[PDB]
């Protein structure tokens, strides 16, 4: 009901250090 956000983290394929992206994604609308 076309408004509002997908959820949204990126964990940046690895590395082991704190690679964590974001993101954006909605109910494309």
Same mark, same amino acid.
Do not use: A, F
């Given at each position: 009901?076309?408004? %509002?956000?997908?959820?949204?983290?990126?964990? %940046? %394929?690895?590395? +082991?250090?704190?690679?964590?992206?974001?993101?954006?994604?909605? +109910?494309?609308?």
């Amino acid at each position: 009901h076309t408004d %509002g956000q997908t959820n949204t983290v990126t964990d %940046g %394929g690895d590395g +082991r250090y704190t690679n964590k992206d974001s993101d954006t994604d909605h +109910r494309e609308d």
